[PDB]
């Protein structure tokens, strides 16, 4: 009587996610086609069509129709609904204010009324997923312009966005910093939480435990997509202890302004190896807070922690859980804020991850998913801050901007709010 | 008072073992970092 709506919006949006649905479609055997093979714990993310396949919660925008276009010539098109692919004509084309003044107004329209449609079929709404990515055009407009109106029709409804952040030096564009800081100011007075999920970072889990050499997208998306089943295991599944999608946002937001974080997931071990390692959870847990093993390019050492929030899913004994724990404290190289004793919120889960076929993941039986908020998140802050400094010193590249609608002094505005965010992380660290 | 590479050298020849993409993608070939499991069990518990 729980369910949650799944919001896609940009060309990695779409890429991004597209690994999320593969992954969960297998985890209760429902085919491509939507006929079930052969309890009712799949509500949480599909809803029923009244007789035969069934229908995902999500929806599909892009500006771009070639992206979005793919989906409908692959395989899977026999799953997912016809009409709820809203599909533009013309593409942001890097441009900020094209894709949220001047092209994306005349698709939003359409957004709100198909998630108003999906909506009133449930009854139990809990909240909502949004993917977009701060590195992409379309992604940066149709995301912010988004925000704002789920806000306003809805209102306390819980929302969670998976944005994906340019790298500190490794990068695609060239005008990601403008649209990451345009792009941050909307996202930060509008959402509950927000994670970090820099592609770089992931790749050095890549080469460092399974030692791909040659990875492409296709394989960053399927460890990106497990993060996304780990979260949600307590909430479709039997569980000694849960997490309720609600009581997330409870336990890790310590001050309303502060409502970013970064998470990592581990153990990743393929099939040829997993022979020597018995995955103990006494070990396992070990490498969660393992600086390397973080997901995204930053340093946990650099400050304090406020509050970690780990998801146990697997066969884990209560007992170990709690006896794992202790040690942690005792640790030097992590140190907690001032004003925070007891700091850990551990879940356990029992159905262990899924192996999607022809993956790099190797079917493991004690798997965790960690979310915490460390002041060390205030570095690629302050990194991204300088970049925004060197190229408007001389204003190089604003003329495309103002030419879609938007005014010079909008970026005035946007580093300040930036600004007091800075300032605001180094002001919770200071111990009373 | 020239041969058939005049300008369209730039395509031939591309048998198809030089078709196929690189090397390995998402797979580690080395042999004790490989992702294919052994056929004794071909899925089992892979822990304790
Ligand atoms: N991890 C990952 N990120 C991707 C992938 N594809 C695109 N991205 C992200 O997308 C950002 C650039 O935007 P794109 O995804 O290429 O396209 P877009 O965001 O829809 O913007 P437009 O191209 O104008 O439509 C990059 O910085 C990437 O971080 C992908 O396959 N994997
Ligand atoms: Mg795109």
Same mark, same amino acid.
């Given at each position: 009587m729980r369910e949650v709506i799944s919001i896609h919006v940009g060309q990695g949006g779409i890429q991004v996610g597209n690994a999320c649905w593969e992954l969960f479609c297998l985890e209760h055997g429902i085919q491509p086609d939507g006929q079930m093979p052969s309890d009712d714990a799949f509500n949480t993310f599909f809803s029923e069509t009244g007789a035969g396949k069934h229908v995902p919660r999500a929806v599909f925008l892009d500006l771009e129709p070639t992206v979005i276009d793919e989906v409908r010539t692959g395989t899977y098109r026999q799953l997912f609904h016809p009409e709820q692919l809203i599909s533009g004509k013309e593409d942001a084309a890097n441009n900020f204010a094209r894709g949220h003044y001047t092209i994306g107004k005349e698709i939003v329209d359409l957004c709100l009324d198909r998630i108003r449609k999906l909506a009133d079929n449930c009854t139990g709404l809990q909240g909502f997923l949004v993917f977009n990515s701060v590195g992409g055009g379309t992604g940066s407009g149709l995301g912010s312009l988004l925000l704002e109106r789920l806000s306003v029709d809805y209102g306390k409804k819980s929302k969670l966005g998976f944005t994906i952040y340019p790298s500190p030096q490794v990068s695609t564009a060239v005008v990601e910093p403008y649209n990451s800081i345009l792009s941050t100011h909307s996202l930060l007075e509008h959402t509950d939480?927000?994670?970090?999920?820099?592609?770089?970072?992931?790749?050095?889990?890549?080469?460092?435990?399974? /030692?791909?050499?040659?990875?492409?997208?296709?394989?960053?998306?399927?460890?990106?997509?497990?993060?996304?089943?780990?979260?949600?295991?307590?909430?479709?599944?039997? !569980?000694?202890?849960?997490? /309720?999608?609600?009581?997330? %946002?409870?336990?890790?937001?310590?001050?309303?302004?502060?409502?970013?974080?970064?998470?990592?997931?581990?153990?990743?071990?393929?099939? #040829?190896? &997993?022979?020597?390692? %018995?995955?103990?959870?006494?070990?396992?847990?070990?490498?969660?807070? #393992?600086? &390397?093993?973080?997901?995204?390019?930053?340093? +946990? *050492?650099?400050? =304090?922690?406020?509050?970690?929030?780990?998801? @146990?899913?697997?066969?884990? $004994?209560? =007992?170990?859980?709690? &006896?794992?724990?202790?040690?942690? =404290?005792?640790? *030097?190289?992590? %140190?907690? $804020?001032?004003?925070?004793?007891?700091?850990? =919120?551990? !879940?356990?889960? @029992?159905?262990? +991850?899924?192996? $999607?076929?022809?993956?790099?993941?190797?079917?493991?039986?004690?798997?965790?998913?960690?979310?915490?908020?460390?002041?060390?998140? &205030? #570095?690629?802050?302050?990194?991204? /801050?300088?970049?925004? /400094?060197?190229?408007?010193?001389?204003?190089?590249?604003?003329?495309? @901007? $103002?030419?879609? !609608?938007?005014?010079?002094?909008?970026?005035?505005?946007?580093?300040?709010?930036?600004a007091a965010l800075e300032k605001d992380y180094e002001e919770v660290g200071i111990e009373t | 008072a020239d041969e058939w590479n005049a300008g369209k050298c730039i395509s031939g020849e591309a048998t198809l073992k030089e078709v196929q993409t690189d090397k390995d993608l998402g797979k580690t070939n080395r042999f004790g970092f490989r992702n294919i499991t052994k056929d004794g069990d071909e899925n089992r518990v892979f822990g304790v």
């Amino acid at each position: 009587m729980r369910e949650v709506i799944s919001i896609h919006v940009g060309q990695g949006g779409i890429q991004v996610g597209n690994a999320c649905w593969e992954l969960f479609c297998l985890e209760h055997g429902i085919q491509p086609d939507g006929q079930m093979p052969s309890d009712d714990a799949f509500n949480t993310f599909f809803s029923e069509t009244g007789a035969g396949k069934h229908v995902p919660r999500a929806v599909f925008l892009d500006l771009e129709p070639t992206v979005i276009d793919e989906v409908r010539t692959g395989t899977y098109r026999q799953l997912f609904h016809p009409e709820q692919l809203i599909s533009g004509k013309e593409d942001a084309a890097n441009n900020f204010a094209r894709g949220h003044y001047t092209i994306g107004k005349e698709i939003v329209d359409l957004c709100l009324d198909r998630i108003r449609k999906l909506a009133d079929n449930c009854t139990g709404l809990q909240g909502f997923l949004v993917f977009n990515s701060v590195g992409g055009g379309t992604g940066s407009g149709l995301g912010s312009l988004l925000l704002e109106r789920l806000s306003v029709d809805y209102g306390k409804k819980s929302k969670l966005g998976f944005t994906i952040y340019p790298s500190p030096q490794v990068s695609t564009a060239v005008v990601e910093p403008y649209n990451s800081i345009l792009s941050t100011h909307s996202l930060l007075e509008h959402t509950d939480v927000a994670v970090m999920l820099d592609n770089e970072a992931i790749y050095d889990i890549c080469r460092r435990n399974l /030692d791909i050499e040659r990875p492409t997208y296709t394989n960053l998306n399927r460890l990106i997509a497990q993060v996304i089943s780990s979260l949600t295991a307590s909430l479709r599944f039997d !569980g000694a202890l849960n997490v /309720d999608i609600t009581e997330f %946002q409870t336990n890790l937001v310590p001050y309303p302004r502060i409502h970013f974080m970064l998470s990592s997931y581990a153990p990743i071990i393929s099939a #040829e190896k &997993a022979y020597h390692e %018995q995955l103990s959870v006494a070990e396992i847990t070990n490498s969660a807070f #393992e600086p &390397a093993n973080m997901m995204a390019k930053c340093d +946990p *050492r650099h400050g =304090k922690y406020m509050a970690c929030s780990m998801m @146990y899913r697997g066969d884990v $004994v209560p =007992k170990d859980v709690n &006896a794992s724990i202790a040690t942690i =404290k005792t640790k *030097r190289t992590i %140190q907690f $804020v001032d004003w925070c004793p007891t700091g850990f =919120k551990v !879940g356990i889960n @029992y159905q262990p +991850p899924t192996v $999607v076929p022809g993956g790099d993941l190797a079917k493991v039986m004690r798997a965790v998913c960690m979310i915490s908020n460390s002041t060390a998140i &205030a #570095e690629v802050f302050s990194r991204l /801050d300088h970049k925004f /400094d060197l190229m408007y010193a001389k204003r190089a590249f604003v003329h495309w @901007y $103002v030419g879609e !609608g938007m005014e010079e002094g909008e970026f005035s505005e946007a580093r300040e709010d930036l600004a007091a965010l800075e300032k605001d992380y180094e002001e919770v660290g200071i111990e009373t | 008072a020239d041969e058939w590479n005049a300008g369209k050298c730039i395509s031939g020849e591309a048998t198809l073992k030089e078709v196929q993409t690189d090397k390995d993608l998402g797979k580690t070939n080395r042999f004790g970092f490989r992702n294919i499991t052994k056929d004794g069990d071909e899925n089992r518990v892979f822990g304790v």
